[PDB]
Tab-separated table of C-alpha atoms and ligand atoms in Angstrom:
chain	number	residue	atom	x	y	z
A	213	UNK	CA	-3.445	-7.713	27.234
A	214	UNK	CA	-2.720	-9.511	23.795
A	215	UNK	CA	-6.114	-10.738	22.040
A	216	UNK	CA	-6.078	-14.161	20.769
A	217	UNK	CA	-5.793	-13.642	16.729
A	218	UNK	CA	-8.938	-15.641	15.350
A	219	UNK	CA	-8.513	-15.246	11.183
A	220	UNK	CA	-9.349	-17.507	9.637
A	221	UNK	CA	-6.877	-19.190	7.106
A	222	UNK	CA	-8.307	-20.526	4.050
A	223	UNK	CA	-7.266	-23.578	1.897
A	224	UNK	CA	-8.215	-23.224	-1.615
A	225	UNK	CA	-7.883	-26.400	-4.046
A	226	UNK	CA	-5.661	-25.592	-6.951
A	227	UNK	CA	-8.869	-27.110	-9.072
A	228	UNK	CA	-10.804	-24.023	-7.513
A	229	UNK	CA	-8.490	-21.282	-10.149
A	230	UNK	CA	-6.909	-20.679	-13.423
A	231	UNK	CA	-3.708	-19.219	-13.850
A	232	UNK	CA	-4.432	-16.504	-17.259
A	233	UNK	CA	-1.108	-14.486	-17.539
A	234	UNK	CA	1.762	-13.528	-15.415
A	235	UNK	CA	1.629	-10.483	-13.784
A	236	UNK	CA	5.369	-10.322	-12.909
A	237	UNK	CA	8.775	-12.768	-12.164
A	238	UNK	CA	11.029	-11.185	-9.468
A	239	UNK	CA	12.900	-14.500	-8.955
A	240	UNK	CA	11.163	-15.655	-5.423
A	241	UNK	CA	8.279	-16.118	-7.163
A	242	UNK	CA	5.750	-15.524	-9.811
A	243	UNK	CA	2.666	-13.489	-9.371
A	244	UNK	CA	-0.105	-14.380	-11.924
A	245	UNK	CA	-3.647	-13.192	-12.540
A	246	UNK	CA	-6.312	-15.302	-12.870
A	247	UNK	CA	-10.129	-16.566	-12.318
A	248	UNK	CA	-11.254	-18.439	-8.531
A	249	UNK	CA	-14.220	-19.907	-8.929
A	250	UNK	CA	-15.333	-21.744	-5.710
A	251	UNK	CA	-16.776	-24.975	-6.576
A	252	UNK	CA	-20.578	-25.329	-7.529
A	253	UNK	CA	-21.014	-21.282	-6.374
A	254	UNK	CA	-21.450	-20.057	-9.630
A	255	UNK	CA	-18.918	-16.820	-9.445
A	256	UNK	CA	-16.016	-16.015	-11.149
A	257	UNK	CA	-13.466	-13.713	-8.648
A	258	UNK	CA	-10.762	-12.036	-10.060
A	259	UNK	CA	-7.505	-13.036	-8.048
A	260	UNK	CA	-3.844	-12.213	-8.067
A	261	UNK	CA	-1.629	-15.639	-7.000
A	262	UNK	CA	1.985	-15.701	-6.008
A	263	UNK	CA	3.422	-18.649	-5.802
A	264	UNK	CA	7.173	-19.237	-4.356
A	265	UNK	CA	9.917	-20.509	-6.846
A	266	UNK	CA	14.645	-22.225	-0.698
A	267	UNK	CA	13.437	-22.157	3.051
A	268	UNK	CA	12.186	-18.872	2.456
A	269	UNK	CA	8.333	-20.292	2.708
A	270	UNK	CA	8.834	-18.553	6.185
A	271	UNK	CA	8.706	-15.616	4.550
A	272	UNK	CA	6.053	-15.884	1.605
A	273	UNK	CA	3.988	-17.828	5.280
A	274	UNK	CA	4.772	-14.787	7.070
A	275	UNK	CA	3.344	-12.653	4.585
A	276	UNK	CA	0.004	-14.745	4.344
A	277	UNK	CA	-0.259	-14.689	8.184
A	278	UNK	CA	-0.434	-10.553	8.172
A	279	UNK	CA	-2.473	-10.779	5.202
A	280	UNK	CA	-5.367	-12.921	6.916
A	281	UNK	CA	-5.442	-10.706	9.546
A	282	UNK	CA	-6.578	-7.532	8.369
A	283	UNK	CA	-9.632	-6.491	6.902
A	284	UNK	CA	-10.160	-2.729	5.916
A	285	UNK	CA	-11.457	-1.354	2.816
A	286	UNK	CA	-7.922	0.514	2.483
A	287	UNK	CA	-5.668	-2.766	2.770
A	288	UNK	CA	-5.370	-5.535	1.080
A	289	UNK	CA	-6.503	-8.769	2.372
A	290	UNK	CA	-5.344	-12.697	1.660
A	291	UNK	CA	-8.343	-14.849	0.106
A	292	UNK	CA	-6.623	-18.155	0.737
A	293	UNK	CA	-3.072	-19.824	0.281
A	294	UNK	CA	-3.050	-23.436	-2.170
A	295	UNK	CA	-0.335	-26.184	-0.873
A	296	UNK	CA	0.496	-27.528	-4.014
A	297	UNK	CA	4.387	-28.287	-4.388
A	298	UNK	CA	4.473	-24.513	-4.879
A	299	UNK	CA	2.898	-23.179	-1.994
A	300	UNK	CA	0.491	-20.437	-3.293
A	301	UNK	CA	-0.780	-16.830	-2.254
A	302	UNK	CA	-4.450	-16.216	-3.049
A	303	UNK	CA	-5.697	-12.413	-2.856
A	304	UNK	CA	-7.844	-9.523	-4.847
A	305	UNK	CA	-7.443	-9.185	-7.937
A	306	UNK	CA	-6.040	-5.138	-8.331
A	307	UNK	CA	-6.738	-4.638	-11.824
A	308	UNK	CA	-4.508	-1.134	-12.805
A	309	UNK	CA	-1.098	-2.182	-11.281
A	310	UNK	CA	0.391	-0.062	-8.609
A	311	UNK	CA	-0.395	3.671	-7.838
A	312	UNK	CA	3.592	4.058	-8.663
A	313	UNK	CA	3.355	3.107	-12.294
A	314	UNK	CA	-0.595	4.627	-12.459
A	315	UNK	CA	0.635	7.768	-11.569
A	316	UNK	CA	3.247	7.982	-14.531
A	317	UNK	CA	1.709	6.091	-17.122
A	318	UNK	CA	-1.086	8.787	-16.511
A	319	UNK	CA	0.376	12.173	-15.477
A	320	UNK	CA	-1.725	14.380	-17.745
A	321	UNK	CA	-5.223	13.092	-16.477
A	322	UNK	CA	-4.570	13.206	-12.883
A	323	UNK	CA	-6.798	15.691	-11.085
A	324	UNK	CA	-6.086	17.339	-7.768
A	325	UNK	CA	-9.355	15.704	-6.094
A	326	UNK	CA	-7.547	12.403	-7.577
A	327	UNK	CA	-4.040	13.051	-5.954
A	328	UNK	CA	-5.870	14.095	-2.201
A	329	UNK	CA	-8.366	11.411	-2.260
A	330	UNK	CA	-5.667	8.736	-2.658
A	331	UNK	CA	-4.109	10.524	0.260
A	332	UNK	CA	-6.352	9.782	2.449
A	333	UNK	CA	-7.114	6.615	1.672
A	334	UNK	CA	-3.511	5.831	2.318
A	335	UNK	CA	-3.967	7.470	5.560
A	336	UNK	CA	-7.294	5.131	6.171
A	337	UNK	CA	-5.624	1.728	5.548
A	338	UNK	CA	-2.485	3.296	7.495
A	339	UNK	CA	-4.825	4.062	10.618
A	340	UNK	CA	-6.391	0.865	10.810
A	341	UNK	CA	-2.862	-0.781	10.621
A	342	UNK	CA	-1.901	1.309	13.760
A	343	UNK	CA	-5.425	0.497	15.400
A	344	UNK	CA	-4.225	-3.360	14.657
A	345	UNK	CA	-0.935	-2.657	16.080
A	346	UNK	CA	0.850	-3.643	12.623
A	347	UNK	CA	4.118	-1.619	11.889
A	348	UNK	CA	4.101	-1.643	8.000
A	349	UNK	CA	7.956	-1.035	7.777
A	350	UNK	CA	7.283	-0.577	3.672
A	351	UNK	CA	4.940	2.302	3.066
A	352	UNK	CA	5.926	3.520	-0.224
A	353	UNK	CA	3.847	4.689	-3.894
A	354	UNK	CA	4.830	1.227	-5.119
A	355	UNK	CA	3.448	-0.758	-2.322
A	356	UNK	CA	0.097	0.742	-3.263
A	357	UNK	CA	-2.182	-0.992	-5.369
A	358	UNK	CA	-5.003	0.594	-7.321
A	359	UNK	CA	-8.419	-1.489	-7.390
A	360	UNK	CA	-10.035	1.485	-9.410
A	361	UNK	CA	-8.671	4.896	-9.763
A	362	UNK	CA	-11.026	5.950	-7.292
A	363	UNK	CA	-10.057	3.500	-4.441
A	364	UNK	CA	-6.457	2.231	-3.623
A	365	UNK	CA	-5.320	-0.529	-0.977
A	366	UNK	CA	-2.176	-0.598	1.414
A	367	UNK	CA	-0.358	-3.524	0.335
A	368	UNK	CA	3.073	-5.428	0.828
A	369	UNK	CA	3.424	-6.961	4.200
A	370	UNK	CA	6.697	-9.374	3.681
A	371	UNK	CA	8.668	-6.405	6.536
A	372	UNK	CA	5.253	-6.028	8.086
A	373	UNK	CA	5.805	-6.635	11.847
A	374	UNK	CA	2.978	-6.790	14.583
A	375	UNK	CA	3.879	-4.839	18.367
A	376	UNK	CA	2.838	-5.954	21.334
A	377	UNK	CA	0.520	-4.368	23.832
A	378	UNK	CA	9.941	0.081	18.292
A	379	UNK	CA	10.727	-3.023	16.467
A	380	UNK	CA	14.235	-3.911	15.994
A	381	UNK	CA	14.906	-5.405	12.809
A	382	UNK	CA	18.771	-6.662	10.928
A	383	UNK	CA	17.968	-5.416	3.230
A	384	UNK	CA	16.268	-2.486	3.317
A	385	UNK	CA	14.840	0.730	1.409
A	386	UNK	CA	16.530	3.443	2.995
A	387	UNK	CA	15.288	6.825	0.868
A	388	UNK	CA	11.672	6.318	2.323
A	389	UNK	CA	13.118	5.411	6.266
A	390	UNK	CA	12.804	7.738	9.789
A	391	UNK	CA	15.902	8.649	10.770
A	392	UNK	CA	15.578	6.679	13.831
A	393	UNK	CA	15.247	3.749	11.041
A	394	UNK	CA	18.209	4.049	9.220
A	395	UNK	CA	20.652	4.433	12.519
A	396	UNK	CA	18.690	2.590	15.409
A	397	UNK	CA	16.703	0.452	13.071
A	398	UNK	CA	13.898	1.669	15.034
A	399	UNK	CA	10.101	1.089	13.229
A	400	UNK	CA	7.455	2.547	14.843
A	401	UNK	CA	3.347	3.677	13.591
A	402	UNK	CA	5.386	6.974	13.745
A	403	UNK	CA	8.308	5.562	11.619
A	404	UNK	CA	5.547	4.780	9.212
A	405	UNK	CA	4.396	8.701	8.937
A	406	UNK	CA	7.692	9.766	8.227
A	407	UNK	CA	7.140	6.743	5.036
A	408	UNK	CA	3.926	8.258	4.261
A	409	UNK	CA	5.318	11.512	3.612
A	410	UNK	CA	7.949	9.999	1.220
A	411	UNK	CA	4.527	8.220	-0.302
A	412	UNK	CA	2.451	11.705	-0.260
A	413	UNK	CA	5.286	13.371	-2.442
A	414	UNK	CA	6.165	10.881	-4.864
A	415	UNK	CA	2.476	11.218	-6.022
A	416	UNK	CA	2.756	14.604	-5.778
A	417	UNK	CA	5.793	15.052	-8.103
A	418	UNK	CA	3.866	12.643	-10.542
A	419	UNK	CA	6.301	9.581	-9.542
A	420	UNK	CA	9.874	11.125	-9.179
A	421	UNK	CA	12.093	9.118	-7.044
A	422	UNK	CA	13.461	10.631	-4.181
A	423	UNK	CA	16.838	11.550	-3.934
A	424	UNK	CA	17.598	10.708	-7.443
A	425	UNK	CA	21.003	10.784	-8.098
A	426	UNK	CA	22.138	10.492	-4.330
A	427	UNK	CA	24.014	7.559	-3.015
A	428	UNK	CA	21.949	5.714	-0.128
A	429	UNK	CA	24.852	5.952	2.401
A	430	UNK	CA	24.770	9.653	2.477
A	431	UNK	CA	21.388	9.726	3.122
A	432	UNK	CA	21.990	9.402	7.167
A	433	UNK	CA	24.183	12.265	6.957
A	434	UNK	CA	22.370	14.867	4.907
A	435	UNK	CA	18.976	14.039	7.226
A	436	UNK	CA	20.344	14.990	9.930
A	437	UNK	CA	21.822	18.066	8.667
A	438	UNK	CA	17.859	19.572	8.247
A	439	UNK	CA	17.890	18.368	4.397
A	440	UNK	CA	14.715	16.867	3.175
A	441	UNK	CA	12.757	16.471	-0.293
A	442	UNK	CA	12.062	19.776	-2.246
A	443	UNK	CA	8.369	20.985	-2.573
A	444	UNK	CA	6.643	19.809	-5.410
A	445	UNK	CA	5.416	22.398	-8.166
A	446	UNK	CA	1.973	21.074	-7.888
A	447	UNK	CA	2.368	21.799	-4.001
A	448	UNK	CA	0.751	24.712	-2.075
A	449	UNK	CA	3.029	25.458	1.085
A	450	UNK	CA	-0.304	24.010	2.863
A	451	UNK	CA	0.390	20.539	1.491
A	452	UNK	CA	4.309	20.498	1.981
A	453	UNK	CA	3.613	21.919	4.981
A	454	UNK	CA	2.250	18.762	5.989
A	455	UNK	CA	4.900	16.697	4.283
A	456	UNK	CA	7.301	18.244	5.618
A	457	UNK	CA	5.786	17.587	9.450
A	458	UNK	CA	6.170	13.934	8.604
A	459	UNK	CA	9.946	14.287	8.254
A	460	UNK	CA	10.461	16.064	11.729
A	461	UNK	CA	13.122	14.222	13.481
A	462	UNK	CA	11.574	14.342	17.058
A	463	UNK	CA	9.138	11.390	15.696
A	464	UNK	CA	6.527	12.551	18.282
A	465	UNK	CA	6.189	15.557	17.461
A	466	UNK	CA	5.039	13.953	13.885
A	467	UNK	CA	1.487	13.738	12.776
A	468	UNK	CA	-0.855	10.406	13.498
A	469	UNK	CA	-2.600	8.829	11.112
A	470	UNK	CA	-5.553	9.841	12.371
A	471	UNK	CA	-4.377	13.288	11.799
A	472	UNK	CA	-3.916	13.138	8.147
A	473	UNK	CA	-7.024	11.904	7.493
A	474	UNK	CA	-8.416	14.878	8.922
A	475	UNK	CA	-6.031	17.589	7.169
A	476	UNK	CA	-5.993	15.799	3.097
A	477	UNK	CA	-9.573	15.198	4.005
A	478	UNK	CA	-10.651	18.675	4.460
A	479	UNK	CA	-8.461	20.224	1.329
A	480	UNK	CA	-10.121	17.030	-0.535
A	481	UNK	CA	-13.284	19.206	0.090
A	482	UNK	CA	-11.764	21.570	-2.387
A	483	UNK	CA	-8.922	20.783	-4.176
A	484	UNK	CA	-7.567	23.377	-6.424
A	485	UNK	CA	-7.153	25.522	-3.643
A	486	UNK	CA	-4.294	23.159	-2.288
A	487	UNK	CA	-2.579	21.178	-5.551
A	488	UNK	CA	-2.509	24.052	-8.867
A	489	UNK	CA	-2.235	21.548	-11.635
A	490	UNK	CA	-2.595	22.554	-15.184
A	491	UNK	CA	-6.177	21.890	-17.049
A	492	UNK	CA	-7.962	20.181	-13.384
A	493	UNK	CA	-9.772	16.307	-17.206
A	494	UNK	CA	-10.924	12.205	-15.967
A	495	UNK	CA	-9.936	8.952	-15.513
A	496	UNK	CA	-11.169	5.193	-16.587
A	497	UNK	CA	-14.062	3.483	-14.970
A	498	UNK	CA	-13.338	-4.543	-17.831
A	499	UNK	CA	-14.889	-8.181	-18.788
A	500	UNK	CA	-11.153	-8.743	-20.858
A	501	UNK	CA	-10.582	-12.664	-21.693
A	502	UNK	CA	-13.834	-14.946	-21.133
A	503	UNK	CA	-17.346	-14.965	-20.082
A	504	UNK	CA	-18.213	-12.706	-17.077
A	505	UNK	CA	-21.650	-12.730	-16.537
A	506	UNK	CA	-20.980	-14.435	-13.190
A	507	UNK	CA	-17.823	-12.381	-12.311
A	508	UNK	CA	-17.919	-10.782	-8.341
A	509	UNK	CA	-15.242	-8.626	-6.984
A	510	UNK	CA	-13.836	-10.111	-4.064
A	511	UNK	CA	-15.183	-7.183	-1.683
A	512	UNK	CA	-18.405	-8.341	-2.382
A	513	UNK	CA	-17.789	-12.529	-2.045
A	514	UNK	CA	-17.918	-12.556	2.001
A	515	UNK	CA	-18.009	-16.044	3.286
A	516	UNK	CA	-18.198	-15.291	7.149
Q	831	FZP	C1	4.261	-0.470	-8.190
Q	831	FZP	C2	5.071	-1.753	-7.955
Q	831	FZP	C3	4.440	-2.932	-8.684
Q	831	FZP	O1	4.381	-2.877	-9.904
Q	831	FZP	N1	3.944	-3.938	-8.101
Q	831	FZP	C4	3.340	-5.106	-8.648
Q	831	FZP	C5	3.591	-5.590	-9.950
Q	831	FZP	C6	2.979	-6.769	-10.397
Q	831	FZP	C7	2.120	-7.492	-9.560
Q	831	FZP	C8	1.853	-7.032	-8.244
Q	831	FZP	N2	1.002	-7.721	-7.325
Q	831	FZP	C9	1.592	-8.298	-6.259
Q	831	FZP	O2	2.720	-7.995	-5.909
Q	831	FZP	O3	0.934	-9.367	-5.522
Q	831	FZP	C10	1.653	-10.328	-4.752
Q	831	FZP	C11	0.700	-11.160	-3.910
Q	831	FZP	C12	0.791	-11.103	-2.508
Q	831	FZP	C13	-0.085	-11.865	-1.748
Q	831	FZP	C14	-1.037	-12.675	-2.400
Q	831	FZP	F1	-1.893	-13.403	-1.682
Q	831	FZP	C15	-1.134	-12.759	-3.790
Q	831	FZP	C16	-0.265	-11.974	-4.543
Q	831	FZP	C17	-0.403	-7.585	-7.445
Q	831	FZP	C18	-1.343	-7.914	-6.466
Q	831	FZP	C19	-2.704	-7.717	-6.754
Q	831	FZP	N3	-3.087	-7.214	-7.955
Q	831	FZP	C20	-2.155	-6.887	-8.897
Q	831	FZP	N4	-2.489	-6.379	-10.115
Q	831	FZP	C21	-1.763	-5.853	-11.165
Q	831	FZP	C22	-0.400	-5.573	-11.068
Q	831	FZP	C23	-0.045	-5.066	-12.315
Q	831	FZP	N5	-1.169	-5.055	-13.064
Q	831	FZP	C24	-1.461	-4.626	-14.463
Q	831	FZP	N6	-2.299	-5.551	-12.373
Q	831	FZP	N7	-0.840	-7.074	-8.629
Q	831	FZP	C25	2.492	-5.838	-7.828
């Protein structure tokens, strides 16, 4: 009852790209941005690359494996991996950072229909996850990545896990975990809701972490005594209501995906009647470093 998985993975020639400026070090690797152009195509794509450095090319493998395998407006996808000595990560290009970072470094220009929108695109890409049977283990504001403000990708799959037809894992993030995470190591599509939630509020309270200030151990302890995050000041009891659903311990009894996308999609319809935010205002629409007459965005470059 298990389909045969028939991505394609793509070998790109480290001729095809140019390294232009490095996005971030975080030891394992380095993640650059830079140009792909395909050979005699005549297009310039706009690419992230992460290359490793170790035996821990199972890992940065692992992570290209999910990554080929998905393909969802709301997620982002793997456009090839390079085996040069460093073996190298190929995707999109997501030109404003993370939605973590976004959200602070822009705080007084974020609209309500900005803040719903996003959640239900997180919902989207989340959905489609669960309709591929992936268990993203990793949801969080951080693992979001922000293509233009008005359209954000899942992103982050190193955890990711994929179900059969309730994983059991043995480092993690524990402030955004299901209970059933933290003490049975349990991950489940529903373990994921109760991450979403975590996501929903720290846009919501403009990037605050959660828990500040608490040490991770007690974090079990307090859960279980009914504790959870305090409603944000932007927050109508209609929104946190909704949060708060995805922090029910009976993780049934929890909203689906499907669900959210629903709910944030009809207060999207209008959204100062669910988030009151002071002065509801815009945000930004990008050539930057050389000619770009020929540039595409990868979500229009399909070869089939
Ligand atoms: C909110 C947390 C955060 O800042 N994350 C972050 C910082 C810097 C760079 C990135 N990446 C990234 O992690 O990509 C890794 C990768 C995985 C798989 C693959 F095939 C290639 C690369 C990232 C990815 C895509 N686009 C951007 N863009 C970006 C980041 C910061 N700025 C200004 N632009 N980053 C994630």
């Amino acid at each position: 009852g298990e389909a045969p998985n028939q991505a394609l993975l793509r070998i790109l020639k480290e001729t095809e790209f140019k390294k232009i400026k490095v996005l971030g070090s975080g030891a394992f690797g380095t993640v650059y941005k830079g140009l792909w152009i395909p050979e005699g195509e005549k297009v310039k794509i706009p690419v992230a690359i992460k290359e490793l450095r170790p035996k821990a090319n199972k890992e940065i493998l692992d992570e290209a494996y999910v990554m080929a395998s998905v393909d969802n407006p709301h997620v982002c996808r793997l456009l090839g991996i390079c085996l040069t000595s460093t073996v190298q990560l190929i995707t999109q290009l997501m030109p404003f950072g993370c939605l973590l970072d976004y959200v602070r470094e822009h705080k007084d220009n974020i609209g309500s229909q900005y803040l719903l929108n996003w959640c239900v695109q997180i919902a989207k890409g989340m959905n489609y996850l669960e309709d591929r049977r992936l268990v993203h283990r990793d949801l969080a504001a951080r693992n979001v990545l922000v293509k233009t403000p008005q359209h954000v990708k899942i992103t982050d799959f190193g955890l990711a896990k994929l179900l059969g037809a309730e994983y059991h894992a043995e480092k993690v993030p524990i402030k955004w975990m299901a209970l059933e995470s933290i003490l049975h190591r349990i991950y489940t599509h529903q373990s994921d809701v109760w991450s979403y939630g975590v996501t929903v509020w720290e846009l919501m309270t403009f990037g605050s972490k959660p828990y500040d200030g608490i040490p991770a151990s007690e974090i079990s302890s307090i859960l279980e005594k009914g504790e959870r995050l305090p409603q944000p000041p932007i927050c109508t009891i209609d929104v946190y209501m909704i949060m708060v659903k995805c922090w029910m311990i009976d993780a049934d009894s929890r909203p689906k995906f499907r669900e959210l996308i629903i709910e944030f999609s009809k207060m999207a319809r209008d959204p100062q009647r669910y988030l009151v935010i002071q002065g509801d205002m815009h945000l930004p629409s990008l050539m930057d470093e050389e000619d770009m007459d020929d540039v595409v965005d990868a979500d229009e470059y399909l070869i089939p």
